[PDB]
Amino acid sequence: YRCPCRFFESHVARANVKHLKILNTPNCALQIVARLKNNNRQVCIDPKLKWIQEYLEKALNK
Amino acid sequence: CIVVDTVMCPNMPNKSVLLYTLSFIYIFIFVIGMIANSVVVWVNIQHCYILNLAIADLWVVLTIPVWVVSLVQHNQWPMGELTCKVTHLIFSINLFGSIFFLTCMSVDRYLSITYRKKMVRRVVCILVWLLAFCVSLPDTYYLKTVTSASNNETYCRSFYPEHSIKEWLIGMELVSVVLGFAVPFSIIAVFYFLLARSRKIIFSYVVVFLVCWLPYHVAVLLDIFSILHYIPFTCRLEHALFTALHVTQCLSLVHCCVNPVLYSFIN
Amino acid sequence: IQMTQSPSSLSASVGDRVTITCRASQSVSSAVAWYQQKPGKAPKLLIYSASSLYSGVPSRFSGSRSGTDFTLTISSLQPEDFATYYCQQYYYPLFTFGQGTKVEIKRTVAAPSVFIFPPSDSQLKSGTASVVCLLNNFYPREAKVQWKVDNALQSGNSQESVTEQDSKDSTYSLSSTLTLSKADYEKHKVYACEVTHQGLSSPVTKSFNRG
Amino acid sequence: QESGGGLVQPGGSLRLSCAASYAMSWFRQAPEREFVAVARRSGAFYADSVQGRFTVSRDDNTVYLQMNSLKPEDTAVYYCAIDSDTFYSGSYDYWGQGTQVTV
Amino acid sequence: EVQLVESGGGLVQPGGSLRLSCAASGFNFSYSSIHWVRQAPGKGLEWVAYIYSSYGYTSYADSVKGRFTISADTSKNTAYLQMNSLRAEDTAVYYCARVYPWWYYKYYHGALDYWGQGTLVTVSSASTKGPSVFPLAPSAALGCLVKDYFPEPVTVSWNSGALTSGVHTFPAVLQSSGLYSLSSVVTVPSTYICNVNHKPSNTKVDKKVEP
Ligand SMILES: Cc1cc2cccnc2c(N2CCC[N@@H+](Cc3csc(N4CCC(O)CC4)n3)CC2)c1OCCCC(=O)O
Ligand SMILES: CC(C)CCC[C@@H](C)[C@H]1CC[C@H]2[C@@H]3CC=C4C[C@@H](O)CC[C@]4(C)[C@H]3CC[C@]12C
């Protein structure tokens, strides 16, 4: 059992993330990956964030 | 605004072929290790470093059937978590112990040439056993069988506190690398080099250890780097890491079979 | 898992806080959702996870967790909040819903109006006798109607059907039908229907005899 | 057994109570037994006549009716009744004695 | 924009089979699992099964395992529940609901975001029949009894839609014979007719009530 993400980032800001990628895998279902502009590093987002799910479920439904 | 991309990872059919291929080499390793380590133990019982090394290697080989059975089912665990926690304990205790007993033999053989001593040697041996046990305990404590809500498929992985997951992964990874390869290899290599002052068998000991355990730790380090997202993600990379991890795991377990022939039979 | 949902039904007036409670049989890691099904329509989602509010619903609804004891709360009940609320968990592979909890309007007690109707002439020739007892404009729903033939209780041949709360009065009406073979209705003389309700000092008996 | 009652000027108030010897109901009897209130395990329903005049409560076992805001129409003996039905069908097997009350 | 429209619901004999459709349109069918939820006629919601559109993971409830089989066709954007050996208890309204299975450390998102207006699936070994109106003369309240009719529904109007106060039409009930029945009553202070329209049998039987 190995999938792209192992842990989330529960403390992230809307103004910091500049790119979101949705990963769909046979092992861990849907997952989110974010590119922070300040650190220019790839991090894994936690769906518990309100704005995250709102934005994502709006993008998929389009 | 934030642009949202979409990515899919279609199933790869090469999994079954590779897993079934390795399930045969594992049986080869199992049989060879038994018929080799059993003879070594019988000889010694009828120098307890080799006895300690033979016992540790034999106990590691005994767990091969469990791993291959779980492997044929695509890394699926049907047995209870009690067996999982127990199996991961005997394997991790005896895999560490065997590596340590190489370092102790490296110093002890050098010690006699340069120079109640048996009492001190026994104390060191028991100390090594307890040290291996303590190092293995953390991972086994956090181990429990799981059943995902999508696959409906049971796996046996390690659950760590959600508020602190990175800490445990990096910590356990660093412990294994810096206490299983970096320190034991350095001590073994330096002492054998000093003893070099036949001269081919000494180089034989060191190179065998390096070849068996170097590529495996490189593969694990690459996996951990990908977890921390230092290496960008892509499906082909995942398959390569999958293949590399399993292949190198096989090339490591050959250690349990090359130990007794290299250290006890060529002499 | 058996997600027991209580109470069975609540009577609440507008502007009155309400609280529906759910209880899982085994631990579920905050995986519980709440739905609202108005009558004759597809259910709706209100609160997922265990207390997170789904987009679009009003802020009145609230959720909470205490071990394995989830709850829902309408802070200020509104006129359009009268429906059935369902409790659903999605931890194990097999999802389960709740038994449902209906929110009913509150109103002053009223007593039923009891009538008994003999079988019609044409229906008699068919071969069966059907006698209907009507309890009209009574609140609350909880009531009981019994059938007595020659001062003997009848059971197994009674079939009830209660309407929904009337818009104007909020008073439920009940109709109990007793069906018998013409070989039976013709061998007895006195029939009676008994209604027991909270707003009645004594049971009301309405009786009639053939002829 | 019901305890309370007495004589009170219009606009006054009283507390009526009755102890054990489910749901409990309060019935009038104008010198025509009438239903005036009821309290269940956990709400309470009041007759249209006394909507706001009175209020019921169930100590947990005694049931208190705050017979408040008297008017020159409430003269009647008040009876405590117990709902023998766990589902509140409306069956009152046990009937109390009551207390004379007048204004 | 989102829509999950169902089709393929109708009368079925016991032991038969029926195939249902759910034409998703307006979202990424590849990323979302699809669930089937059935609500008996007057009971709480019940869960049937789901399917992962792309990876083809499916789970079935304990009461449909071995009889139902859910599949999907991404190219067609539909999900099919094929039911075999249908029983009488399978009568219900079936909804298909979308889900986006987000990954949470301990569980997966499983709140049914969107539902589609269900489709009734009657499973009865009966035959089309007309009603048998019978009058309930006053013994003021009066009514007509519509007995032994099939299939639903039956529409009842009084005096050609002339009465719109005190008229009660109780919900239909199912008896042992397998046919439906309902009674309609109206209260009037001391000529009344009860028009009926059973379209599924092209029947229009009127009657007059008087003692
Ligand atoms: C067949 C097999 C071979 C392995 C070879 C090397 C390592 N592991 C192997 C393994 N697993 C890997 C999982 C983590 N590993 C943790 C662990 C404990 S001690 C240890 N060493 C680290 C290096 C150090 O130099 C000495 C100590 N690593 C448990 C065992 C195997 O089993 C297959 C897993 C199937 C499943 O996942 O179901
Ligand atoms: C069965 C499991 C759960 C317990 C762990 C057992 C294995 C991993 C370890 C625990 C400590 C180990 C023992 C510790 C000390 C000695 C003395 C030595 O001169 C020979 C080996 C021997 C006898 C070891 C055999 C292997 C052993 C029993």
Cα dist. E119→B105, E6, E7 in Å?
77, 6, 7
Note whether E14 and E125 are within 8 A (CB). yes
Please tell me the experimental approach by which this structure was elucidated.
cryo-EM
Q: Give Cβ neighbours of residue C141 (< 8 Å, ≥ 6 apart).
A: C104, C162, C172
Q: Say yes or no: C202 and C169 in one domain.
A: yes
Q: Say yes or no: E97 and E148 in one domain.
A: no
Q: Say yes or no: C96 and C117 in one domain.
A: no
CA A18 from chain center: how many Å?
Answer: 11
Q: D interface toward C at CB cutoff 8 Å?
A: 23, 25, 27, 33-35, 38, 43, 45-48, 51, 83, 85, 87-92
Distance from CA of C164 to the nearest CA of D (A): 18
Range(s) of the domain holding residue A50: 1-62
Q: Give Cβ neighbours of residue B79 (< 8 Å, ≥ 6 apart).
A: B66
Q: Which atom of ligand 1 is the closest one to the Cα of B253?
A: 5
Residue nearest (by alpha carbon) to ligand 1 atom 37: B75
- CA–CA dist A62, B8 (Å, integer): 18
Q: Is the peptide bond before B215 cis (omega within 30 degrees of 0)?
A: no
Q: Is the peptide bond before E189 cis (omega within 30 degrees of 0)?
A: no
Element (H, E) at C144: strand C144-149
Strand partners of residue D27: D35, D79
CATH classification at residue E171 = 2.60.40.10
CA neighbours closer than 13 Å in the CB half-sphere of residue B189 = 10
CA D29 from chain center: how many Å?
Answer: 11
Domains in chain C, number: 2
> Residue E89, Cβ neighbours under 10 Å: how many?
9
- From B247, B229, B238, select the one nearest B11 (Cα to Cα): B238
Q: Say yes or no: C174 and C202 in one domain.
A: yes
**C199 interface with D at CB cutoff 8 Å:** yes
Q: Give Cβ neighbours of residue C153 (< 8 Å, ≥ 6 apart).
A: C146, C147
Put residue C169 in one of left, alpha, beta given phi > 0 → left and psi -120 to 50 → alpha.
alpha
User: E-chain residues within 8 Å CB-CB of B8?
Assistant: 30, 54
Range(s) of the domain holding residue E176: 132-209
Tokens of residue C84, six digits: 């059935």
Residue ending a domain, among C76, C104, C132, is C104
Q: C interface toward A at CB cutoff 8 Å?
A: 49, 52, 55
Tokens of residue C89, six digits: 């968990």
For the Cβ of B79 lying below 6 angstroms from any atom of ligand 2, the answer is: no
Phi/psi for B172 (5° steps) reads: -70, -40
User: C-chain residues within 8 Å CB-CB of A50?
Assistant: 52
For the Cβ of B48 lying below 6 angstroms from any atom of ligand 2, the answer is: yes
Domains in chain A, number: 1
Range(s) of the domain holding residue D42: 2-101
Give the relative orientation of helices B166-177 and B117-141 as an angle to the nearest 10 degrees: 150
DSSP C150: S
Range(s) of the domain holding residue C22: 3-104
Cα dist. C125→C130, C182, E134, E149, E193 in Å?
12, 9, 11, 18, 21
SS3 call for C49: coil
Of A31, A57, A61, the CB nearest to E103: A31
> Residue E182, Cβ neighbours under 10 Å: how many?
22
Q: Say yes or no: E80 and E99 in one domain.
A: yes
* Strand spans (E) along chain E: 3-7, 17-25, 33-39, 45-52, 58-60, 68-73, 78-84, 92-99, 114-115, 119-121, 132-136, 141-149, 155-158, 167-169, 173-174, 180-187, 192-197, 208-209
With 0-12 / 13-18 / 19 or more C-beta atoms within 10 angstroms meaning exposed / middle / buried, residue B7 is middle
Q: Do E57 and B152 touch (CB under 8 A)?
A: yes
DSSP E199: G
CATH numbers and ranges of domains, chain B:
13-265 (1.20.1070.10)
Q: How many inter-chain contacts (B to E, CB under 8 Å) are there?
A: 19
Residue ending a domain, among C104, C138, C165, is C104
Q: Which long-range contacts (CB under 8 A, 24 or more apart) does E49-57 make?
A: E49/E81, E50/C95, E50/E99, E51/E79, E52/B150, E52/E101, E53/E29, E53/E79, E54/A24, E54/B8, E54/E30, E55/A26, E55/B11, E57/B150, E57/B151, E57/B152, E57/E33
Q: Which residue type sits at B218?
A: V
Tokens of residue E201, six digits: 């049998």
For Cα atoms C24, C29, C35, give the angle at the middle one, nearest 5 degrees.
Answer: 60
Chain C: list its partners (3+ Cβ pairs within 8 Å): A, B, D, E
Residue of A nearest to B77 (CA): A1
- CA–CA dist D59, C6 (Å, integer): 23
Residue nearest (by alpha carbon) to ligand 2 atom 6: B90
- CA–CA dist B96, B139 (Å, integer): 13
Q: Give Cβ neighbours of residue B199 (< 8 Å, ≥ 6 apart).
A: none
SS3 call for A29: strand
Tokens of residue E154, six digits: 């039956």
Phi/psi for B160 (5° steps) reads: -120, 155
Q: Say yes or no: E197 and E98 in one domain.
A: no
Q: Say yes or no: C90 and C119 in one domain.
A: no
Residue ending a domain, among C104, C123, C144, is C104
Domains in chain E, number: 2
Q: Do E45 and C37 touch (CB under 8 A)?
A: yes
- From C82, C68, C77, C55, select the one nearest C29 (Cα to Cα): C68
With 0-12 / 13-18 / 19 or more C-beta atoms within 10 angstroms meaning exposed / middle / buried, residue C67 is exposed
- From E128, E117, E123, E118, select the one nearest E17 (Cα to Cα): E123
Sign of CA dihedral D65, D70, D71, D76: positive
